[PDB]
A paper describes a structure:
Mutations in TREM2, a receptor expressed by microglia in the brain, are associated with an increased risk of neurodegeneration, including Alzheimer's disease. TREM2 contains an immunoglobulin-like (Ig-like) domain followed by a flexible stalk region, a transmembrane domain, and a short cytoplasmic tail. The stalk region can be cleaved by ADAM10/17 proteases to generate a soluble TREM2 fragment (sTREM2), while the C-terminal intramembranous domain is further cleaved by gamma-secretase (Wunderlich et al., 2013). sTREM2 can be detected in cerebrospinal fluid (Wang et al., 2020) and is increased in patients with neuronal injury or CNS inflammatory diseases (Piccio et al., 2008; Rauchmann et al., 2019). The co-crystal structures of two of these antibody fragments, scFv-2 and scFv-4, have been solved in complex with TREM2, revealing interactions with epitopes distal to the putative ligand-binding site.
Author numbering:
A (entry chain A): 20 to 131
B (entry chain C): 3 to 124, 139 to 247
The structure:
């Protein structure tokens, strides 16, 4: 199975994705949306291009991404959660023409 | 292939409990959100409850909130609604509903069940439809308007309920047509006012049409409905 991450609409949700800091050393990370069982993963956010500045929060839409490089932890922060933000998502390590799946996370949004 | 079969409807005396079980066949159950939507006899639609793909997220309407309990079993592909401490106004046709989004809310309730009758012996976003009644002839361009109170951008859905039959998703995202919808239907709109257009009306289009807010604010409220009957 995969881990479920619940968030109240309008509030922020912080998803964690630990990874081997040495196996993926020098590889940027991404956070994408799964569109089906065999469907593609549509990119939502990506860490900063420079590998040093990956710890900072790269913002796309209302989704920020930080990458603790030395500790090896990919944090995603979805602020002002909306119902259309609900779905299955992937943490990915990008290398060359490929992307390895670190963790599959189901994001669900609750009312107030 | 796809089928949703409700069970448990009938008569229940007031105050008592009642369980409704929906059997699902012909699709991927564990991936799609599910729900129950009611229709009072000869009245418009009204959302009852929604349940998550993992079952760990339930959303009841404010009326039934605190009394009903939605449930699901993915190993048996069944969707339950437990109506404890019923009431006299709860009576309606209850419809088992698929969400049609891979772990997301997707486009809208795509496939509806045929529903079961539950009778009992005795702020919000207002979605208003103009008009309520309309008498047209075969081959008439018809226009229906749907108005929201607060802006909803482009997250409007149009459903078409045939006389006595279960509804079906017609227009998703206001602009685009559902796969299989005839070419003549044309949805449009943005913000607060939205319009649906029938160009060259055909005989099987005489029916009730409902609009719904779907995507922005979790009060996924339906419209009051427009009855396109015959002249
Ligand atoms: C930002 O999100 C949009 C919406 O999914 C996507 O089309 C776009 O590629 C994203 N930008 C980046 C840099 O990933």
């Amino acid at each position: 199975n995969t881990t479920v991450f619940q968030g109240v609409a309008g509030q922020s949700l912080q998803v964690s994705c630990p990874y081997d800091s040495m196996k993926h050393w020098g590889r940027r990370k991404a956070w994408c949306r799964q569109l089906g069982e065999k469907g593609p993963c549509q990119r939502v956010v990506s860490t900063h291009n420079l590998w040093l500045l990956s710890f900072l929060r790269r913002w796309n839409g209302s989704t920020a991404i930080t990458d603790d490089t030395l500790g090896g932890t990919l944090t995603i922060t979805l602020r002002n959660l909306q119902p259309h933000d609900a779905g299955l998502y992937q943490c990915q390590s990008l290398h060359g023409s490929e992307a390895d799946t670190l963790r599959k996370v189901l994001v669900e949004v609750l009312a107030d | 292939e796809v089928q949703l079969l409700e069970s448990g409807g009938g008569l229940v005396q007031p105050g008592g409990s009642l369980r409704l079980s929906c059997a699902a066949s012909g699709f991927t159950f564990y991936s799609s959100y599910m729900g129950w939507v009611r229709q009072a006899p000869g009245k418009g639609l009204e959302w009852v409850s929604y349940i998550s793909s993992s079952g760990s997220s339930t959303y009841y309407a404010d009326s039934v909130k605190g009394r009903f309990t939605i449930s699901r079993d993915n190993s048996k592909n069944t969707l339950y609604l437990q109506m404890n401490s019923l009431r006299a106004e709860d009576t309606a046709v209850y419809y088992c509903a698929r969400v049609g989004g891979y772990y997301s809310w997707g486009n809208g309730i795509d496939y509806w069940g045929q529903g079961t009758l539950v009778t009992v012996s005795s702020s919000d976003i207002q979605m208003t439809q103009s008009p309520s009644s309309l008498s047209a002839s075969v081959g008439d361009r018809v226009t229906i308007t749907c108005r929201a109170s607060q802006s909803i951008s482009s997250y409007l859905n149009w459903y078409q309920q045939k006389p006595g039959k279960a509804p079906k998703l017609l227009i998703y995202a206001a602009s685009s047509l559902q796969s299989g919808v005839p070419s003549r239907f044309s949805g449009s709109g943005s913000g607060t006012d939205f319009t649906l257009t029938i160009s060259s009306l055909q005989p099987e289009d005489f029916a009730t049409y409902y609009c719904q807010q779907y995507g922005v604010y979790y009060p996924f409220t339906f419209g009051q409905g427009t009855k396109l009957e015959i002249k």
